[PDB]
Amino acid sequence: AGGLSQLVAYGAQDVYLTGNPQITFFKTVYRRYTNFAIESIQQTINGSVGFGNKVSTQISRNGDLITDIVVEFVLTKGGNGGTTYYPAEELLQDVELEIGGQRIDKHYNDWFRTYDALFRMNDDRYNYRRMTDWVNNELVGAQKRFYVPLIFFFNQTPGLALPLIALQYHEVKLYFTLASQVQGVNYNGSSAIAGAAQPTMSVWVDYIFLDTQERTRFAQLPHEYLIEQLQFTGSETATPSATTQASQNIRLNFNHPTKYLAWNFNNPTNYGQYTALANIPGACSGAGTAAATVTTPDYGNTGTYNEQLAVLDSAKIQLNGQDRFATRKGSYFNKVQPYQSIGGVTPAGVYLYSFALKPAGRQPSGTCNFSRIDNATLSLTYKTCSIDATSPAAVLGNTETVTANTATLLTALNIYAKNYNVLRIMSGMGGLAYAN
Amino acid sequence: QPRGYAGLRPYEKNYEGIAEADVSALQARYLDQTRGRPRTGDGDTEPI
Amino acid sequence: GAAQPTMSVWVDYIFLDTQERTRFAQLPHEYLIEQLQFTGSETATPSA
Amino acid sequence: ATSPAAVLGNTETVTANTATLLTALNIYAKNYNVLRIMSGMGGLAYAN
């Protein structure tokens, strides 16, 4: 009776599992670590903070190592419910890290949105929005304090913390450019919101303080850090109207070993819109009613999962004249590649192809060395934009090779690649090892 | 004395701040070279 | 209509002679500095 | 508080009803510490 009845029922087929065992995991031994403390310290912003303005913040050297950095904004909403869509990261137009004069990385607002949509998942993603959007149908005039955590190579991985105690000779700083227009806060569509408040920004950095022997070791020894970079050059789409299946051949200007190639298609006017607009509930302003229009999204629901409103038909990557893998349909890059590699759900309009087994992981697991490829081209075939977006009968019931007529608004082509590089810290001076 | 020192509220002995120079030193340079052209790099001499 | 304040922070510098600057740069120093300790709290003032 | 007859004419243990607004308690201490400076590095000898 009980568990003893299967323990005695022992034989040869058990040896591969329990014969001459190596571990018992009911006695877990935890490894003793190095004494440290975490502190949040406010930084001082250089330059006037404002819409369309660029400011810089130099990180005050109060502690030994840097891990996360969170940008704090105070925003007042100029619209009502459903008029905003992650406005905090739209405002944070771009950020770059400069170590002693050498730039390491450059992130853009639509990257932050892509990353959140592609790699951050479950409750975490929802909480991210809580920190970056208004999610409980708040009304006009509401004030909210927003937080946009940064995702550079050291921000979310303690193991890659920036070793300030070992950069005795270099300045470490971030540059911040804030967007000129934020939907529902400064502009509603392309129309200015009269009386809109100017959001206030503060940049906070979380410091790690080390004990006696480890601080000495970090300060006096050289370091080899494996770091991540974001590569980006923007382009334009070729989205057709009727009877033509467009195809683009975008030669990539990426360098170095990367983890993946990711892209989306954007409506430059409506931040975060990666799909067509259609008279489907939750897809457009007034959707489902006589006031419905397909020229204006229901901004609080800008992102969707209905691939029918997607613009991409099929794609492949070609290297040096030869195919990298066989042609796959657009739905393959939106749902299957992230299933096989990230483990989350990717919304419609965001597409991923990985070169790595764990592209979401910090541990290197495969790559693509673009600096050794003569011609890397991304081939994108588009859907025919013949569906009348105003008729749910046509939007919810048509073939796989067609999309909405309103897809022609996704005129910006955003292709990103995420890199590997090495950050060398020697005699208090930092710089990256590999050029290009 | 009614009490002995409990050991509470101790201090760090001779704590130094972060070693930070005011020199903003030259960005360290890359170890490799800018990659050029693999098929026709450095130019091809053309005969007269 | 209240205007924003304009602030300018001025610092008084001491320039010393060459021999004393040498001593300051080379030698260890200990300064018996003063600190201020403060936390805010609340008091219970009676009525009647 | 509005009647000088009481405010200027009462005893040591009695004050005005308006004293009840002095609700913020501010307690300051001034102490020594030592600033130790050696070869370009400095810090508090007794740090917290």
Partner: peptide, 25 residues
């Protein structure tokens, strides 16, 4: 003559990044 946090000792490299000096003029 130096506290440890000041710098990693310079050796086994020759980028010629930093100057030698007396530190007083």
């Amino acid at each position: 003559p130096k506290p440890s946090p000041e710098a990693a000792d310079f050796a086994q490299f020759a980028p010629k990044n930093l100057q030698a000096q007396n530190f007083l003029t």
